[PDB]
Design a protein around this ligand. Sequence first.
Ligand code: ADP
Ligand code: ADP
Ligand code: MG
Ligand code: MG
Ligand code: MG
Ligand code: MG
Ligand code: MG
Lengths: 460, 412
Amino acid sequence: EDYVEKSVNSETKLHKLADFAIDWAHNNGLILRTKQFLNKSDVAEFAPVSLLPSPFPRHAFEKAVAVHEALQLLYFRVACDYEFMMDAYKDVVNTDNHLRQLVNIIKDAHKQGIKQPTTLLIMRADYMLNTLDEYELKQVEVNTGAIGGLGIDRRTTELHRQMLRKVGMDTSNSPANNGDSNMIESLFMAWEAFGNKNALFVFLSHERLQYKFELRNIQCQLEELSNGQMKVEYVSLKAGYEQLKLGEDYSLLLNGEIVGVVYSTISALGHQANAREMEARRTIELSNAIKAPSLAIAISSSKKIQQLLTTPGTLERFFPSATEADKVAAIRETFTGLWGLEKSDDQTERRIKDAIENPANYVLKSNNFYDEALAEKLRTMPQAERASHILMQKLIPMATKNYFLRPFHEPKLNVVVGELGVNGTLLGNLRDQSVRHNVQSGHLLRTKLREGVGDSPYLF
Amino acid sequence: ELEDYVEKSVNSETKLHKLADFAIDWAHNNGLILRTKQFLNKSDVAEFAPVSLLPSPFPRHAFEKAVAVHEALQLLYFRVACDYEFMMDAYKDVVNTDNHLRQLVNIIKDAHKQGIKQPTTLLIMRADYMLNTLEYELKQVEVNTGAIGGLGIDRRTTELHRQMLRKVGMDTSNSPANNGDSNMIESLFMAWEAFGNKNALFVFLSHERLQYKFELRNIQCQLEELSNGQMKVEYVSLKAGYEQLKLGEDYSLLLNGEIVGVVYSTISALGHQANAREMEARRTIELSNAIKAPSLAIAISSSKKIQQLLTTPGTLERFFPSATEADKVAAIRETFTGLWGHILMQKLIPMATKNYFLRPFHEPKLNVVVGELGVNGTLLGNLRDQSVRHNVQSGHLLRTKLRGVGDSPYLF
Ligand SMILES: Nc1ncnc2c1ncn2[C@@H]1O[C@H](COP(=O)(O)OP(=O)(O)O)[C@@H](O)[C@H]1O
Ligand SMILES: Nc1ncnc2c1ncn2[C@@H]1O[C@H](COP(=O)(O)OP(=O)(O)O)[C@@H](O)[C@H]1O
Ligand SMILES: [Mg+2]
Ligand SMILES: [Mg+2]
Ligand SMILES: [Mg+2]
Ligand SMILES: [Mg+2]
Ligand SMILES: [Mg+2]
């Protein structure tokens, strides 16, 4: 399919469609704070997006959506398996102080005993298409720890349905995208589970952020759902050092008030936190607040754990019963090759040799090098760094054409590639590993120049 | 009274910023926005519409009076617009000193000589009132008929103010419903159907550089929804209209060769000082069979001179001759203050209150302020026989200045 080129047949049509889309974005809240004023909402720009929804195979979309609940159950169980988590991090700990401080928080939480059984896992699974013209769906990453912008994603779908109508195309191949509703319902469900209507709901978030309008949408809808009863607050880890305390009953206290939910948009793995920020993370973690997500759930989505999960028998540790072989198989077929660099087997040294000699087949990742950069990193890597890196099979994605809409850039025709993101939530119990609500809801396309922007799939 | 609840409800700089911060984010999330001053030709960035932090106190009696009289006020000005002899007489002297008004009246003269080609027209009116101090009486300051918009801004302002009221623990039932934007759209769609050709364009006669572009886009999307994707919309200015608008040999209005069924003006006939090319576009529009929202005669019926003439004894009774319509005449007349034949007007002394202004990049503070109540509506009429298909009041606003910004009433 190259319907985008077929549907946009002049510069006059390009500007008429772009102009409409930009105004639509502002009118429907598909917006971010400007880079110039990340601390201020006085002005806002539209979220960067494709002009039309990028073609995506229907089979691959259906596969990715279908496996998500089982994928969420997997990572929930991984997070709950203390012995597995400590073993996966035993080497990485010695070379990386950020990950050491985080694992020590989890160690301290485990030895004090868990004070709050209810937790909310929030996951995005990312996939690319890999070429065989037929394509297989393969998983690139899993993200737990800080998931947001689901309102941006829905609005992007809605925009694309409008754009499809404008160029005379059927909108039934644009799938429904209501993740933001699940986010809010799940967050509200978590707030009720705390069992104290005077307990605060806290957005653990940066002061300077593009996504502030998105968080405000969650706030308004949470307040509506609680009939004005839920008090909401915003705090960063920097400010949390002074403002968050652990009460003598293990309550989380924000300026002395009980907090019932901490919804993190500050990634535990992604955000390089200083010593004051880690002490706030610790305080949160040792408290009886429902965490969305808990630290153990946040750090379960590292590249090392992604790699370990591909080793035979490892998936079966979390799904031991023959009744769950269908989940194991469905997850396994979305994996491509991943390998660790830690040990001195002959299997690993041959893998390293293969990648040095044939680097176009690989991507080298830390907790990203390509081609001769990859071969050189492998040649010159110190003994210590081996454990903080994994080898992954290189995926060759489907290429299409599309226009990008970005603040203050003329749109033009680019060759582009998509990355499919599938979102969901799981509300669970850490003590007995039961599940109250495990759903897939919401998706996106992230589209880049091949040689990026928000996008949504048009299924074929 | 509830006359300084704003001061009572906002008792620190900390509370002021927490409320302001919430309101600004709410505005962007709900489309209470305008294009930036820096980039009036571009929608890439947008700022929030300037508004009061809380809804300004306004007497319930005065609001109810202004809303109640509106349909009769609309009927009055419709009938004024349709009375060619009255309009020419009101402008006979003014014409000789003012070239802008001369060109406009000459368009109406040329339309009258050719015979009017489209009987259906849509009057869009805002009546402005100030409170006058004695207790307060409601008095009319102005009537506006040639370019009315921003009713979506007004509704959203009401919605914002209901949110702010909840945040400071105040009852929202004294904030009246404000759904003028829906009437605007329904009335505009009604006008488009009355043309009787689903392939006919709907045209926003509008500036290219304007803060209100997002508002017009909202109307576009809702008109397209209401037509089930059938209505084609376009935008054109009078500058661009010189070359792009033509009068067809059957009196069709042609925008780049396509038939136009409705011309909705947001370029004021009295307010916008138009050049010679722009007046020829205005003429083309006016001589065509497009339904005009509003027609030029309706737009120029709302001059200060006509406002003044309407206060002279027996002049209201020209348009409402029957004893049966003396109740309308009396209800309209009690909202008039003194006017005499520019023109002399009696000075009104408005009610003062306190409020905070939210404006892009300026810290809010407590100001002494005065309000001006705007009441909106539409009338879909027939110029040939003077009949009326739809005459409703819908929508209002407060415009609040330092003794400005968008505001909404909190009734007491
Ligand atoms: N196996 C792979 N083959 C090809 N490209 C990849 C592969 N893995 C990652 N990439 C590219 O690199 C990008 C970033 O790396 P990723 O591992 O997803 O980490 P993160 O999203 O946390 O930065 C991906 O979005 C994708 O475009
Ligand atoms: N009779 C009056 N007494 C006091 N102020 C007036 C009077 N008439 C007009 N004003 C003030 O002048 C402003 C603008 O005048 P107006 O006649 O409404 O023209 P326009 O709104 O078309 O510019 C009003 O908003 C009001 O503040
Ligand atoms: Mg990624
Ligand atoms: Mg990850
Ligand atoms: Mg099964
Ligand atoms: Mg005025
Ligand atoms: Mg006037």
